[PDB]
Ligand binder design. Structure first.
Ligand SMILES: [Mg+2]
Lengths: 70, 82, 94, 177, 156, 171, 148, 120
């Protein structure tokens, strides 16, 4: 119940870098893993939409907020 | 109460997060098939090629044989995988 | 049925090419980057008068090094070690 | 899970039957979905060499609704072998003389242009009425969501929703209409 | 600014709403504790990890082979500890970092079996009437790896 | 610990059979040192020599070294080999009923969960096994009887903990 | 040229990575020539490298024919039975040493298309995907267009 | 005839609106730029190719620093349509003798001297 562009965008918007080969392998031999990934992608999409609509103040998405590095 | 996807097949959906926010965790328990969602077990060339095609819903081209060239080109000792 | 003159990209008549949204967005972002570069290129720091000889020493040193490397252009040396080891092609055992 | 080798393979490489319905819907989206389901694209193990597909059954092909004015614009022409046999029949005439051809040609053109096109077409079935054979009916499994949403005429909104919708203007009390 | 319900008054997609942050964090902590207890009880079986080695993400499980197209300078028969894992799990639970996971959380044990070479690859270039005919054979190095097991700790 | 004595004995006989022994001997260059007659050496003499070498390693090294060798070779030779394929059985329904009686008497209500097609010569039925309104396992199959047999086999696997989701090993 | 060349799936000879590690190299037979300029490298190797190579791994036995040969060869046998009879005609000591090390490191597996550089025995853990996945089940499993 | 395209003086004249839009400022301006070629040298005149070769931008998508002086300013403007320019602002002091092995460029021009591999 998702699309490839939005799914890839939501997966990239979570610091969860995963190539396409591993994604296909999981979808083939691990339906539950891909289901959880799709759920996380939909949650990130909804959080981003809510943020763009209300500009946050001050949730900033429980799943968003990338981990900074130095 | 929120649910990003309908938990009515394959497994449920429960996205989790650690206190440090560095690793994501999930809990996808498999869904069991209910008891009321089941049912009780109840208790010559041309014509032959056409019948086979109608039975297998395939075309009438692959049914015919091939020459010895393709027969010999076929590998009888394929690589055993798994 | 669409018969047109030879070669569609030259001559008196050519097939009319139309622009899409991809090329439009590409040109827009390119113009934005160009305007950013223009803005960044509108604030000097030395005003020319302050750069009448602040690094000529480095240029002279680099030129001297290049000249020394060029003048060093000479054939290699020679040694008797290789000429004597070449005789080992007939190394014999007992 | 477990599942032995041969049974697991036969299960993962099995052919499933689907059901599609028209009734005031466009044929393009229906044909696209039928081709996607026949080529096996819907499955995660899609490939041409694997020969993965699923039968697609469409019913009520006579109640198809076109968009715009395609009923008197789309010309389904076809030239024969003999000369002068350039037939240029419109969509309305082709549907009146053959209501099981529009979606057929749509799915034929949507599917790839390879030798598997004929097999994928033979895997598909069409019916211009609600009557379906018993074998196919028993073979059908599940029903994917329909494409269009149906505009719903005024004779289905119920009086409750009609009353809930407030007016917008006030015609004169002495208007002869 | 009321808008009567029409075919375009509101968007077509369902307007969902997210829960509160306090309850969300509470549920997150509860699920984390549940997963930690499940891991401590030893309920998992046959773990799998996506090891990003040799610039490639391999869906590693257990007792599987891997062949890399380069040299690592390691004597055949030495244990190796891989890192950069970002997708660990098994059944009824999963784990993934942001991106990489903690070192003390995952431990991938691997070994070296052999260091062979690739089959004779042929290189060739040709052009039209330009007398261009170039040929070359290449035999890049290869290796073999075997992941013994994938341990896990309750570090959460 | 959930496996019976018969299954354990059958698995031991399979591992100590002839095919795996011959494979291990030919992969360990043991056939090149077998002082036997009529080359190639038959499987019986090869297995005898292999067991003699095992006994020699035992009498020389010790029990721990021999156990480690066994775990590393024989137990490793049965990694991909799924259950039943190594220990052939007949009528899995009988074994399932016996295991249930040993646990709790309850006739498994064989019920059809999902079916693909029908009378098309290429069906796919998902036969289940309801144990007091509580499914314990399931498995697909071509026909109905074959599907029920596969479901019973998967149920036996789950009961014995031999499914693919088991533990790899402890080295 | 894969279609006109045999292939083989990636796999091991005995899963040595799991338990103990066994050297796949069996024996090595060197055919060095006493009198001849076509085996100076092999002679220097057998002189001041073969001993070190043999002592670095006592699980391999090496032979030295030392017969009147015109082209020095090396027979690298393996446990499975493969044989790699290569030639070392005019080669430096370092090259011969590297070749011997490579032969000892590799296994008897053929040198052809490996196809799929991975041999996952049990790739499915959460249940292999089948057409009846991620789908619900109606009441009593009533197929579409079913009254009773 | 396609001559050498010149640029007038009214172009390079940052206005208050431009300064407000971006982060740069007139007083105390940057001293170095971050040149990064984003366009190929082909399909361009020969003098532009020579300028690109002199600037040292053979491999595209590569960072480069040059002096912010009138001469280099004009040299950059000559190919402005083929390179990306950005200021090199150092949050901390310049790289000392001790801060030369652990460094990083980082996007948006931010040369960090304490480049580590750990999370905040
Ligand atoms: Mg023309």
């Amino acid at each position: 119940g998702l699309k490839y562009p939005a799914l890839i965008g939501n997966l990239v918007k979570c610091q969860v870098e995963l190539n396409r080969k591993v994604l296909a392998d999981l979808a083939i031999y691990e339906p539950k893993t891909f289901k959880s990934l799709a759920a996380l992608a939909s949650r990130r999409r909804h959080e981003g939409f809510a943020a763009a609509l209300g500009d946050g103040k001050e949730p900033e998405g429980i799943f968003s907020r990338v981990v900074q590095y130095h | 109460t929120y649910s990003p996807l309908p938990d009515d097949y394959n497994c449920n959906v429960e996205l989790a997060l650690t206190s440090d926010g560095r690793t994501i965790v999930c809990y996808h328990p498999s869904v069991d098939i209910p008891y009321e969602h089941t049912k009780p077990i109840p208790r010559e060339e041309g014509p032959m090629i056409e019948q086979l095609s109608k039975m297998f819903f395939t075309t009438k081209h692959r049914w015919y044989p091939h020459g010895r060239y393709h027969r010999c080109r076929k590998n009888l000792n394929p690589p055993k995988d798994r | 049925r669409g018969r047109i003159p030879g070669r569609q990209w030259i001559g008196k008549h050519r097939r009319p090419r139309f622009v899409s949204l991809r090329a439009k967005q590409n040109m827009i972002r390119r113009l934005e980057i160009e305007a950013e570069n223009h803005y960044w290129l509108s604030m000097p720091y030395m005003t020319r008068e302050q750069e009448r000889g602040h690094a000529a020493v480095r240029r002279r040193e680099a030129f001297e090094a290049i000249k020394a490397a060029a003048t060093s252009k000479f054939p290699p040396h020679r040694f008797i070690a290789d000429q004597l080891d070449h005789l080992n092609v007939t190394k014999k055992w007992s | 899970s477990s599942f032995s080798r041969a049974p697991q393979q036969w299960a993962t490489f099995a052919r499933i039957w689907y059901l599609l319905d028209g009734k005031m819907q466009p044929p393009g989206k229906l044909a696209a979905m039928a081709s996607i389901r026949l080529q096996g694209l819907h499955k995660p193990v899609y490939h041409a060499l694997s020969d993965c597909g699923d039968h697609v059954v469409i019913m009520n092909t006579r109640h198809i609704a076109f968009s715009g004015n395609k009923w008197e614009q789309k010309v389904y022409s076809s030239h024969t072998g003999y000369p002068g046999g350039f037939r240029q029949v419109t969509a309305a005439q082709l549907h009146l003389r053959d209501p099981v051809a529009i979606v057929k040609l749509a799915i034929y053109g949507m599917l790839p242009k390879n030798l598997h096109r004929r097999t994928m077409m033979e895997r598909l079935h069409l019916f211009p009425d609600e009557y379906i054979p018993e074998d196919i009916l028993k073979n059908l499994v599940e029903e994917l969501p329909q494409p269009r949403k149906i505009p719903k005429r005024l004779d289905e909104y119920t009086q409750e929703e009609i009353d809930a919708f407030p007016r917008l203007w006030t015609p004169p009390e002495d208007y002869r209409l | 600014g009321y808008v009567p319900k029409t075919s375009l008054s509101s968007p077509p997609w369902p307007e969902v709403v997210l829960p509160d942050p306090v309850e969300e964090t509470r549920h997150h902590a509860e699920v984390v504790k549940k997963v930690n207890e499940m891991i401590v009880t030893g309920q998992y079986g046959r773990l799998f990890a996506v090891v990003h080695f040799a610039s490639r993400q391999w869906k590693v499980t257990s007792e599987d082979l891997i062949l890399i197209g380069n040299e690592l300078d390691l004597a055949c028969g030495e244990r190796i500890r891989l890192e950069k894992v970002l997708l660990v799990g098994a059944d009824n639970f999963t784990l993934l970092g942001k991106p990489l996971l903690g070192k003390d959380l995952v431990r991938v044990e691997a070994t070296v079996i052999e260091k062979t070479e690739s089959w004779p690859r042929i290189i060739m270039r040709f052009r039209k009437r330009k007398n261009f005919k170039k040929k070359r054979i290449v035999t890049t190095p290869q290796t073999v790896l075997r992941i013994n097991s994938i341990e896990i700790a309750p570090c959460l | 610990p959930d496996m019976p004595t018969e299954g354990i004995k059958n698995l031991v006989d399979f591992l100590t059979g002839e095919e795996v022994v011959c494979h291990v001997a030919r992969n360990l260059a043991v056939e090149q040192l077998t002082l036997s007659e009529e080359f190639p050496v038959p499987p019986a003499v090869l297995q005898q020599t292999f067991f003699a070498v095992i006994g020699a390693l035992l009498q020389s090294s010790g029990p721990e070294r021999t156990a480690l060798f066994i775990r590393d070779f024989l137990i490793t030779q049965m990694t991909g080999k799924e259950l039943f394929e190594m220990w052939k059985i007949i009528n899995p329904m009988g074994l399932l009923v016996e295991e249930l009686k040993k646990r709790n008497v309850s006739a498994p209500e064989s019920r059809l969960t999902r079916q693909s097609g029908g009378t098309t010569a290429l069906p796919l039925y998902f036969v289940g096994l309801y144990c007091d309104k509580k499914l314990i396992a399931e498995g697909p199959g071509e026909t109905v009887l074959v599907a029920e047999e596969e479901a019973a086999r998967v149920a036996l696997r789950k009961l014995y903990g031999f499914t693919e989701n088991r533990r790899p090993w402890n080295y | 040229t894969a279609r006109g060349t045999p292939s083989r799936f990636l796999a091991s000879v005995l899963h040595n990575g799991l338990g103990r590690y066994v050297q796949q190299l069996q024996r090595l037979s060197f055919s060095v020539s006493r009198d001849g300029a076509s085996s100076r490298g092999a002679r220097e190797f057998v002189e001041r490298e073969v001993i070190d190579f043999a002592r670095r791994n006592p699980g391999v036995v090496i032979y030295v024919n030392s017969r009147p040969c015109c082209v020095p060869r090396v027979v690298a046998e393996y446990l499975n039975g493969a044989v790699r009879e290569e030639s070392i005609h005019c080669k430096s000591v370092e090259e011969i040493s590297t070749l011997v090390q490579k032969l000892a490191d590799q296994s008897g597996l053929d040198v052809i298309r490996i196809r799929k550089p991975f041999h996952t025995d049990n790739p499915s853990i959460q249940g292999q995907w089948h057409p009846f996945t991620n789908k619900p089940t109606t009441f009593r499993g009533l197929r579409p267009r079913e009254v009773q | 005839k396609f001559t050498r395209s010149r640029i007038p003086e009214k172009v390079f004249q940052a206005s208050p609106e431009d300064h407000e839009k971006y982060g740069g400022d007139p007083q105390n301006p940057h001293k170095l730029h971050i040149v990064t070629r984003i366009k190929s040298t082909r399909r361009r005149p020969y003098w532009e190719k020579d300028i690109i070769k002199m600037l040292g931008l053979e491999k595209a998508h590569t960072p480069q620093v040059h002096k912010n002086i009138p001469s280099v300013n004009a040299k950059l403007k000559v190919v402005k349509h083929l390179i990306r320019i950005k200021p090199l602002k150092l949050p901390q002091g310049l790289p000392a003798e001790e801060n030369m092995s652990n460094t990083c460029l980082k996007s948006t021009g931010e040369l960090v001297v304490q480049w580590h591999l750990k999370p905040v």
